[PDB]
Amino acid sequence: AKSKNHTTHNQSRKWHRNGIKKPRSQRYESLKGVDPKFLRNMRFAKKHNKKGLKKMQANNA
RNA sequence: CCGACCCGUCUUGAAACACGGACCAAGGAGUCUAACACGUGCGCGAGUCGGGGGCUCGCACGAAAGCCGCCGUGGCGCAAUGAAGGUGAAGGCCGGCGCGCUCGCCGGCCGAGGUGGGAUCCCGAGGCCUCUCCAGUCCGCCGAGGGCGCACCACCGGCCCGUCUCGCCCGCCGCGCCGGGGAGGUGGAGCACGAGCGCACGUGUUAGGACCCGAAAGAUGGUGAACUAUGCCUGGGCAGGGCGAAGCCAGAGGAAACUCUGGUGGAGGUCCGUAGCGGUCCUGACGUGCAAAUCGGUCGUCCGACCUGGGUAUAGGGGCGAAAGACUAAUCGAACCAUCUAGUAGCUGGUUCCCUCCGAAGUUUCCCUCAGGAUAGCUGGCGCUCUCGCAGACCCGAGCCACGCAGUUUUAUCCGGUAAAGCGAAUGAUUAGAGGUCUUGGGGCCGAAACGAUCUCAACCUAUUCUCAAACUUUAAAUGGGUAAGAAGCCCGGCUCGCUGGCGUGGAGCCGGGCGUGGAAUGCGAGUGCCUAGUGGGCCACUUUUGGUAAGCAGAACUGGCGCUGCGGGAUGAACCGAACGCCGGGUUAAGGCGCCCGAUGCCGACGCUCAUCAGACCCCAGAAAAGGUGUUGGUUGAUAUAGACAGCAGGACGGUGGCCAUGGAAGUCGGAAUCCGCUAAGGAGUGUGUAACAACUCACCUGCCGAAUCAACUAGCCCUGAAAAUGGAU
RNA sequence: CUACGCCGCGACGAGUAGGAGGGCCGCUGCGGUGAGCCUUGAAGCCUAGGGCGCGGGCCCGGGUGGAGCCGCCGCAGGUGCAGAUCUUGGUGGUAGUAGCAAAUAUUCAAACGAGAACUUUGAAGGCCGAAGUGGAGAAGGGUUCCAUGUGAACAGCAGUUGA
RNA sequence: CGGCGGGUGUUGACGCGAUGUGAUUUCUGCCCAGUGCUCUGAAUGUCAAAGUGAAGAAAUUCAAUGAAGCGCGGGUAAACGGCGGGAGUAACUAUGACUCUCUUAAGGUAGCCAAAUGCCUCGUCAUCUAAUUAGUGACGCGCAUGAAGGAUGAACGAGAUUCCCACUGUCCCUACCUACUAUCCAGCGAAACCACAGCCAAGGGAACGGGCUUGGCGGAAUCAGCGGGGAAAGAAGACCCUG
RNA sequence: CAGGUGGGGAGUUUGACUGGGGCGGUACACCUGUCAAACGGUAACGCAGGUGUCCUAAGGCGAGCUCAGGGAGGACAGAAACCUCCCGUGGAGCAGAAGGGCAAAAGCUCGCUUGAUCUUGAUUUUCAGUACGAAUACAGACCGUGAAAGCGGGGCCUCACGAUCCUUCUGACCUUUUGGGUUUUAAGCAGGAGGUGUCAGAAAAGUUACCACAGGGAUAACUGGCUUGUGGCGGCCAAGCGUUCAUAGCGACGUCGCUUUUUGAUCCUUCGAUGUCGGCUCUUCCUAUCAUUGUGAAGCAGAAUUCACCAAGCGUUGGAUUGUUCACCCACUAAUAGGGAACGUGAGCUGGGUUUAGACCGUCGUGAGACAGGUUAGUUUUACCCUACUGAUGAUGUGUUGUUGCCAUGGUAAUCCUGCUCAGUACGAGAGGAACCGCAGGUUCAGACAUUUGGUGUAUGUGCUUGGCUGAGGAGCCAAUGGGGCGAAGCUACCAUCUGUGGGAUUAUGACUGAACGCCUCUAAGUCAGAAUCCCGCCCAGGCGGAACGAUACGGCAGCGCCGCGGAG
RNA sequence: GUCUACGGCCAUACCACCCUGAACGCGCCCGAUCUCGUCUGAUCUCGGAAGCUAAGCAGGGUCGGGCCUGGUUAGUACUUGGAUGGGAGACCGCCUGGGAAUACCGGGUGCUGUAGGCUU
Ligand SMILES: [Mg+2]
Ligand SMILES: [Mg+2]
Ligand SMILES: [Mg+2]
Ligand SMILES: [Mg+2]
Ligand SMILES: [Mg+2]
Ligand SMILES: [Mg+2]
Ligand SMILES: [Mg+2]
Ligand SMILES: [Mg+2]
Ligand SMILES: [Mg+2]
Ligand SMILES: [Mg+2]
Ligand SMILES: [Mg+2]
Ligand SMILES: [Mg+2]
Ligand SMILES: [Mg+2]
Ligand SMILES: [Mg+2]
Ligand SMILES: [Mg+2]
Ligand SMILES: [Mg+2]
Ligand SMILES: [Mg+2]
Ligand SMILES: [Mg+2]
Ligand SMILES: [Mg+2]
Ligand SMILES: [Mg+2]
Ligand SMILES: [Mg+2]
Ligand SMILES: [Mg+2]
Ligand SMILES: [Mg+2]
Ligand SMILES: [Mg+2]
Ligand SMILES: [Mg+2]
Ligand SMILES: [Mg+2]
Ligand SMILES: [Mg+2]
Ligand SMILES: [Mg+2]
Ligand SMILES: [Mg+2]
Ligand SMILES: [Mg+2]
Ligand SMILES: [Mg+2]
Ligand SMILES: [Mg+2]
Ligand SMILES: [Mg+2]
Ligand SMILES: [Mg+2]
Ligand SMILES: [Mg+2]
Ligand SMILES: [Mg+2]
Ligand SMILES: [Mg+2]
Ligand SMILES: [Mg+2]
Ligand SMILES: [Mg+2]
Ligand SMILES: [Mg+2]
Ligand SMILES: [Mg+2]
Ligand SMILES: [Mg+2]
Ligand SMILES: [Mg+2]
Ligand SMILES: [Mg+2]
Ligand SMILES: [Mg+2]
Ligand SMILES: [Mg+2]
Ligand SMILES: [Mg+2]
Ligand SMILES: [Mg+2]
Ligand SMILES: [Mg+2]
Ligand SMILES: [Mg+2]
Ligand SMILES: [Mg+2]
Ligand SMILES: [Mg+2]
Ligand SMILES: [Mg+2]
Ligand SMILES: [Mg+2]
Ligand SMILES: [Mg+2]
Ligand SMILES: [Mg+2]
Ligand SMILES: [Mg+2]
Ligand SMILES: [Mg+2]
Ligand SMILES: [Mg+2]
Ligand SMILES: [Mg+2]
Ligand SMILES: [Mg+2]
Ligand SMILES: [Mg+2]
Ligand SMILES: [Mg+2]
Ligand SMILES: [Mg+2]
Ligand SMILES: [Mg+2]
Ligand SMILES: [Mg+2]
Ligand SMILES: [Mg+2]
Ligand SMILES: [Mg+2]
Ligand SMILES: [Mg+2]
Ligand SMILES: [Mg+2]
Ligand SMILES: [Mg+2]
Ligand SMILES: [Mg+2]
Ligand SMILES: [Mg+2]
Ligand SMILES: [Mg+2]
Ligand SMILES: [Mg+2]
Ligand SMILES: [Mg+2]
Ligand SMILES: [Mg+2]
Ligand SMILES: [Mg+2]
Ligand SMILES: [Mg+2]
Ligand SMILES: [Mg+2]
Ligand SMILES: [Mg+2]
Ligand SMILES: [Mg+2]
Ligand SMILES: [Mg+2]
Ligand SMILES: [Mg+2]
Ligand SMILES: [Mg+2]
Ligand SMILES: [Mg+2]
Ligand SMILES: [Mg+2]
Ligand SMILES: [Mg+2]
Ligand SMILES: [Mg+2]
Ligand SMILES: [Mg+2]
Ligand SMILES: [Mg+2]
Ligand SMILES: [Mg+2]
């Protein structure tokens, strides 16, 4: 008839058998969820980075 | 001699008083097809595949093999996206031009962009050489740095299709409700120089009998009334007695009506009782029988709704029923036979060789789900991508020592509201006094008279005071949770922006350059993908904890264990304590032990405590409390004592006063108050006995004899009482 | 140095459900191969015989048997049993046990015969007691009827008797 | 299944068919609200198909009309069924003839009762006994009696119950006898059941052991009985739950 | 063809959780506080509650105010009508449950309004990191408000809700409507709504005692096990009762236990079955003792009674009613104590009760049917196995065999009452009224026995007798023992008769001597008496235990014993 | 040494009462034509400058309340980990680390940023 309802017994052991790994912190996070206005201006800046290349290389030289 | 319970199975737990198994032989259970998915092997490869057909002495093999190529039709792949109409995947640089207006017209090139990682490869200053040197010939190794960067990963761009928002151009044999193009978001199982196709094998899932065996049922078509049930037809049968209906005769009495008496007669779903038919009781016999319903005695009925043969009729959701769901061939709340059918089963049982390696879950979410699934988790297998190097042919290193990770600490830095604490702090609960002064508090005795007054009790206020809170809180731990402890960092410059804006502003991105003491300890090699079984009943212990009187009860948290685990110890035992396991020899231990069983104290072990006429004897754990003891042993506090304690033996224990109010005696003692004085050696106007009451005693108080220590109240060790259960018995 | 081989060093070893690997473990059949084995003795079976392997198992000796069988490389399965109140067959203990007890009852002599409680004959004692344990039919059976012979099996003891 | 098919029916209301109750005697009360059944269609409400009209280019849509049935209206309880409460009140108390109200479709009438029907209950009283949860008689606010079934009443009953006389081995309290067994023998000869087996106490353990631990102890092979155990056998529990 | 009727018939369904199921409840979808052990998460049919709504404002913005309460004042006016001042950290209000939050607020009052609108994505919460719901931050429109900064895409926050399929509506001068075109129609694309409350979402009434199957000890009914609330039995304190007097005998308020003979709680074993009540029969055990033996105490004069100790040896009965366990009554008695053993005991019985199928009544139900309501009728199977027990042969060893014995060990048995005398005695005012020794007998039990009495009787012994049969007499027989009278022997009956026993150590208790503790003291050392108890005797059996003693193998080759350490082995 | 405007932290800043205040300032104050609101020029808005520091405000004071910070409470309460420690239990002791809160007793009573004034 009746039976056990809930437990977390042995659950921690199951969790730690393969380790509780943190998320893989990797360079260049995704731009998901960033403000769209800021993102579109960022895209415009990236697009127009091409101009001023001669000035950039002159300064570098 | 030591060890040793019977296997299989379900189970948290099996040696179980849980089930199956008397024994032996033979048979006996994950198969085949189809479809997927992934992995592996093979061939070819932007293709691949003849499987259907055809051609080849038609055929021992050969029903094979070989070949087709204008037999590649076709399948799958090579293009996606949209419901669809439909549409449908190339960009980067140098420029001259409108106005290089965030854009329109062309050239020259190249051909899927860039950032950060990135095995490998390339260059490489400088080193390693011999008998030595000034001087260059050829190549080998190490090498700081630098370069091109595979696959793959993260990110930023770009392109295709759908759909929104904004907006301006372009095209024409149809100037249109025509067609095309742009920018910015967003939806797609896309593109971004293919990876598929065929065959084989393995695993997993599914449909099929589907691992094997197993229902109660449902449907179709037939066979039965030789038993029984009922109707009909035609036959057969039922001793002996009792009662005595109508009708009748005679005699008698009556005016009649009629009545009385004696016979006669022989009716009746009548009575006793054979045969027959039935079947009450013994709850008899028997109960592996004589018998799958019988036998003995006793019984019901026995001229009738009676018993019975044969012939007929009614057939299964039908019959037939004086009705019991009875009977319908030992079968009836729906017969029997065959078939559909190997029906289905989330349920039970079983499931066949060996060794090696790894090794669980009883938990999350959803489900007409709670004995089941899906899902995540836990498991295994297959790998792949990287890191340290692989060193000297024996030998011999010649500040700095890997990508990265962690059930851990340290150093910083946050987070919290439990334990505790608090209530003279809020919110609730709550005890008792104290001090104040207003009132629809009671009132208060002489106040009415202006309670002339002020006495008490209330309420109220004030300062205190006792006790509390899971659903209170000022304060507030321990344990705990997050983050950081660098090269993705720091610092210099420069460029882009349509975002932001006094500003060369802010922010973000991008491009170069320089910094290595690698910026705590300790340990460890990491990252990543695919497929995937079993499980999804748990239980126990320390501690925390809810319900309950409690429970070997029910429910949670943490860790460990049992399940899945043997071994040493606890005599015995799933969980306790120790410790985890290949087969052995030697040494030593753990926990636990060392009188004998039974290895080891057969030590000249140490110090004490304890006598039980129910002693005691080791975690879990297997039995006890309050309360007592002048048993004994310690300890605490206090008291008395040569100005003679204590204990014994012996005296006084009075006067007022036989004190007052209680009275019917209470005179010291049935009760209420107060505790005087003096004699002194002391005496309570009384600790008890008692007398009706007197009286007579005793005590506390003093004294005498006695001559050295003694007394009291507690306290806690062992022991004892408290302490009663059933077969004889358990450190 | 069978490179699918050989050699060295270090650490490690519990295991249900489950997963994987190896098997010079085992069964049956097919393609190859062993110029394999075999009537001078195959398979199978038995064995206080000798051994090998951790093991699954295997080899050899002895006996019995009397005609086929096996190793290796591949291939393919209706391929391995202690259980399923498993299927079929066989066999134990129980156990020379329960039992051969419903309806009164047999005895004597003789014959046949190897053999007599049971057959036959005679004598005796009983029973059914005419609603029979008598004499005849229907249904049903189907040769059981009758004579002779036998003593295998059957007649739950026996039989010289018998459906 | 079907045919103007068939049974009642070779029949015709003193007949067939369908029900209830159950001889005789005496009775069979009230309720048509409910559910049934039935009668009437009265203007009548609703009401399908078909048919009619209209709109439309048609599909189609709309409207008008309006069969049974249902609603509306009567009847019917020997149709199914049903048949109440609360207060006060008589010159001792106690009851309540009587009086108030609320309510129903009607409020259980005649009868009968601790009945085979009454919980409380072993009701109360009487009788039967020494003693009676039994029996009988009586009472009745009766949990929850009651009229096609109530109440009676001879005869009858393998029906249930109580008492009395007689009778007895039912018993006190057992004994003896007879037949057939059992028993022993000759012959013949099964079956059920069977993990292995079979002496106990306690312990622990799936919380009641034949096995294990600790103790008690243990002597071949057997016969006749026996019913304590083997949680004996017989059947995959029929109770309960789940599917 | 259409509508109605249609359990006559057909098919099917008749949720889940659940300290068994049902009834109850919703712990089934949500929300607050707690549990919850200071991150988060965390369960029970845990506790306290709430929800399926409400709101054109209670949404949005802006402005201006301050609330609850209290104190002091003012005509009617009072405890509460309005006006004024002061204090007022919120003690108010914010729709609702609760928690959090809020003061020139988020509250109150005004003014203007519709951001409760049109859109794409991302994210948080539950989470599998799926959905729904809800929510957060943005971005793009169109707006509202304010001077403006700003704020607003519902409600201050934590809840107030819903897939596929289908339907309905709205939008695109949109797509398709199948050879083409036009127009209706239909289909589609996007967004709302109609709902699944079992709230991740079937379309669903009963009954079965006529029942069935697969299972379940995952799960109740009976034993056992844990617990002991309840039941039962005790203890501690002593306010009181007890003519005075707490404790002779009791024990309020409190409090500590024990027991498993009550009833519960739980669900560990058993559902391929452990036969379920009571009675009968029979044995054993316990003591918390009713009687009896030995004692102590009393509010014990005697008698009777009461309390307590050692103590379970022995006994604890006959009946009416009821199925009863319990109960109650009658009567006897020394007493008529309480219990256990699978609520002992069904292959021991019985079957009255409960608890199958038939049937009647009452109540309930429309009905099938139901009822810890009443009533009546209702199959009780097997032992031959092992052990245990009861008896019966035997077995091992002493060379064989016999006689006579011993005793290890086991069993064990006696019990109670009455009458006479003591004795109308002690004691007592009286009423009443014992005891010790002794005597005579009985009860229950045990072991026998048959002289007597009784029973049996198939000596089938002897008469009598019925029916039949042998021709009759005589003699007999048959009738399953024909019937009956008397009856030997044997067996047998409290239905006759006989017999039934002695010590020891001691318990309780009462004492001696005697310290501890110059006194006392039954105790500490040492002593005494002491019983239905205990042990033994008497009695029953006699060990895989012994003793003493007897006889020990031919008339023929045949066996044996002792002496020899005699020999070879 | 102070003030004003705008603030940051938000009581060491608050609350009650008392004392002092030079110069600027801040205020109180005067008035309602205009702007704008009222039952009321009280508030709000506007136009002013006779008087006043009475009040706000600033500074100081109080064996002041509060608040802040210490000591005590106290290595107490509580607590991580350990034992085949004790005890019938309830609970308690020890080892290993951490470690509070009242009452009670002290000290303190705003600091400061930007801009602009006054103070010989
Ligand atoms: Mg579970
Ligand atoms: Mg099983
Ligand atoms: Mg179980
Ligand atoms: Mg087992
Ligand atoms: Mg068991
Ligand atoms: Mg069983
Ligand atoms: Mg089973
Ligand atoms: Mg079996
Ligand atoms: Mg078998
Ligand atoms: Mg086989
Ligand atoms: Mg071919
Ligand atoms: Mg083609
Ligand atoms: Mg790259
Ligand atoms: Mg990209
Ligand atoms: Mg798969
Ligand atoms: Mg099958
Ligand atoms: Mg069906
Ligand atoms: Mg017939
Ligand atoms: Mg008759
Ligand atoms: Mg008759
Ligand atoms: Mg019988
Ligand atoms: Mg019936
Ligand atoms: Mg089947
Ligand atoms: Mg199961
Ligand atoms: Mg909390
Ligand atoms: Mg606390
Ligand atoms: Mg408080
Ligand atoms: Mg538990
Ligand atoms: Mg449980
Ligand atoms: Mg398991
Ligand atoms: Mg494990
Ligand atoms: Mg282990
Ligand atoms: Mg061990
Ligand atoms: Mg032990
Ligand atoms: Mg060793
Ligand atoms: Mg030992
Ligand atoms: Mg030893
Ligand atoms: Mg004791
Ligand atoms: Mg292993
Ligand atoms: Mg097979
Ligand atoms: Mg086999
Ligand atoms: Mg026999
Ligand atoms: Mg016999
Ligand atoms: Mg005769
Ligand atoms: Mg005849
Ligand atoms: Mg013949
Ligand atoms: Mg024979
Ligand atoms: Mg009739
Ligand atoms: Mg009537
Ligand atoms: Mg009509
Ligand atoms: Mg009428
Ligand atoms: Mg009446
Ligand atoms: Mg009545
Ligand atoms: Mg009755
Ligand atoms: Mg009677
Ligand atoms: Mg009566
Ligand atoms: Mg009357
Ligand atoms: Mg035993
Ligand atoms: Mg079953
Ligand atoms: Mg069954
Ligand atoms: Mg039906
Ligand atoms: Mg916590
Ligand atoms: Mg928490
Ligand atoms: Mg405002
Ligand atoms: Mg917006
Ligand atoms: Mg909001
Ligand atoms: Mg749901
Ligand atoms: Mg269970
Ligand atoms: Mg008194
Ligand atoms: Mg049985
Ligand atoms: Mg049994
Ligand atoms: Mg006693
Ligand atoms: Mg019993
Ligand atoms: Mg029995
Ligand atoms: Mg029985
Ligand atoms: Mg009965
Ligand atoms: Mg019945
Ligand atoms: Mg009967
Ligand atoms: Mg026998
Ligand atoms: Mg003896
Ligand atoms: Mg005895
Ligand atoms: Mg005669
Ligand atoms: Mg004669
Ligand atoms: Mg004769
Ligand atoms: Mg006769
Ligand atoms: Mg006689
Ligand atoms: Mg006698
Ligand atoms: Mg003396
Ligand atoms: Mg003594
Ligand atoms: Mg003595
Ligand atoms: Mg102060
Ligand atoms: Mg500590």
Both tokens assigned to A28: 């260049």
Resolution (A): 2.5
A10 touches strand B (CB under 7 A): yes
Tokens of A43: 């895209």
Q: What amino acid occupies position A6?
A: H
The kind and range of the H/E element at A13 are helix A11-17
Contact indicator for A32, A40 with CB cutoff of 8 Å = no
Place of tokens 């017994």: A9
Q: Is the CB of A32 under 7 A from strand E?
A: yes
CA distance A46 to A51: 10
The CA A52 to ligand 53 mean position distance, Å, reads 120
Q: A31-48 burial by CB neighbour count: b if 16+ within 10 A, else e?
A: eeeeeeeeeeeeeeeeee
